[PDB]
Design a protein around this ligand. Sequence first.
Ligand SMILES: O=C(O)c1ccc(-c2nn(C(=O)c3c(Cl)cccc3C(F)(F)F)c3ccc(Cl)cc23)c(OCc2cccc3c2OCO3)c1
Ligand SMILES: O=C(O)c1ccc(-c2nn(C(=O)c3c(Cl)cccc3C(F)(F)F)c3ccc(Cl)cc23)c(OCc2cccc3c2OCO3)c1
Lengths: 257, 265
Amino acid sequence: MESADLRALAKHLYDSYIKSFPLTKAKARAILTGKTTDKSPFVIYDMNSLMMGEDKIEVAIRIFQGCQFRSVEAVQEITEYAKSIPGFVNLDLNDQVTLLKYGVHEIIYTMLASLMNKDGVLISEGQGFMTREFLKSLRKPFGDFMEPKFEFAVKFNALELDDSDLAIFIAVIILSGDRPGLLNVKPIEDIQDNLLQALELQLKLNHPESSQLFAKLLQKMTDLRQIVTEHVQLLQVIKKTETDMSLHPLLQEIYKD
Amino acid sequence: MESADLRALAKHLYDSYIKSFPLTKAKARAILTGKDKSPFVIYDMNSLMMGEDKIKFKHITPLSKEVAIRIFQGCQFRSVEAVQEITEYAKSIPGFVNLDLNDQVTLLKYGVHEIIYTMLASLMNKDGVLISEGQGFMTREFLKSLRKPFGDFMEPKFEFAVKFNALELDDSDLAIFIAVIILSGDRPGLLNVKPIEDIQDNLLQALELQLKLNHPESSQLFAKLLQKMTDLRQIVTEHVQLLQVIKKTETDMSLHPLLQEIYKD
Ligand SMILES: O=C(O)c1ccc(-c2nn(C(=O)c3c(Cl)cccc3C(F)(F)F)c3ccc(Cl)cc23)c(OCc2cccc3c2OCO3)c1
Ligand SMILES: O=C(O)c1ccc(-c2nn(C(=O)c3c(Cl)cccc3C(F)(F)F)c3ccc(Cl)cc23)c(OCc2cccc3c2OCO3)c1
């Protein structure tokens, strides 16, 4: 509840966010808008370019497993970031697990948007770019599993957040006192209140011409909760057809309840 | 013409050290020496069962049921919090945040073990260790008597602590010492050693002056303190080898994968 302390917290979370995540939104936007010369991605738009892409950098399964593997790495990255949020590690250890269990998916979607435009998504640390049309054209259940990520990303990216905004936003999501099964809601909400104050000041200073960006950003936490539910529900259905798939135990545990 | 600058740097680090760490050495010594508000003492299984039911130690609450495992992991979890505390303290060392971000991460990664040991001695005497911000006191004998490898994992910390505490450092000494450890130019993988050593050279100057003024009767205390970095590197190395033996033999260490992720380092 002090401006300079709120600014200090924003700088702390931004700095830690840079340390925890390999590919920032700033880097991803430089790659996506191009204009540069050797940060240029190889573009995978069909079966044959995928085959060529392996030498430079079932098709639907291999792409799914590529997402699963990246998602697991994201969980690791998010987990390392979470420990830097002031107060998180001091919480009851079961609550730490619970907050990560229910928060990682919402964060993955958020940060996935940083890697997307309307035409595709960066992969392999920005070295490749896989087109939305190719992903949507994958077979049976896999195509319609890829596309909702793009649907969200386009809407979310219209807010034009930069990384210093996202670092606080991601922190706010993690410290959600309403997660099922929390033992100690009060210290979680005390931390989130500081993060919320920090976010509000951040958005007012960094986006002063963007009216009610704070409220509009929080209304996006609504769209996240819905899409994680559809994702989980659709992911389970895929399990009932595809035994040539298996989830990483880290993800397997997260989805269990 | 920089005596006053070293005092300023000394005071700056002392003030910041007080803000970052929960239980100071000065406070911890009053408790250990008995100088009212007496900590709960854990000297065996039944007293542990009572203290976790009364005081509710956060690192020793069920989340394995085996007591020696639960105490081992409780140390791990407290070490995780200490890392964040040291990380926040590091940001206050003049020049640290201006270093290359990868080097900041590298220095913290390879220093936290040495610092946690150093600061653990503050909470220790020859008879046990303070826990939960001084609310509990777990005896050396109870820790040393734990089964299989866990007992022999606890006791080397006390052996180091007893020798380190004979230097009789206070918090104003330790604040500079901890900073010197952090700014180690020989950590593997550093990108830009020169500014790291430039800072350590200032911190070393401040530590030397601090020790002469604070311990004028303790000859070559500076040299003796730097010689303890030998004892630190050695035991951190031994510590790593002891953890791997525990990991490769103990089938009862399963935790939720998220928790394993938090504790990964
Ligand atoms: O770099 C990243 O930060 C990142 C993050 C997420 C994906 C990605 N996951 N995903 C999932 O379903 C998913 C999600 Cl959201 C959350 C949890 C578990 C899963 C799982 F388990 F079910 F997957 C996607 C679906 C579609 C798209 Cl477009 C991307 C993702 C990510 O994807 C990079 C990527 C995209 C296409 C092909 C790839 C690839 O990496 C290698 O090959 C990056
Ligand atoms: O409050 C503190 O400032 C503190 C600091 C350290 C410990 C503690 N770590 N530990 C380790 O092995 C260890 C060490 Cl040195 C360095 C790096 C990583 C580790 C790790 F990761 F491997 F742990 C100990 C071993 C024995 C003892 Cl005695 C204490 C420590 C500490 O421990 C307090 C504590 C907390 C909960 C249960 C306890 C307990 O002490 C006994 O039971 C506090």
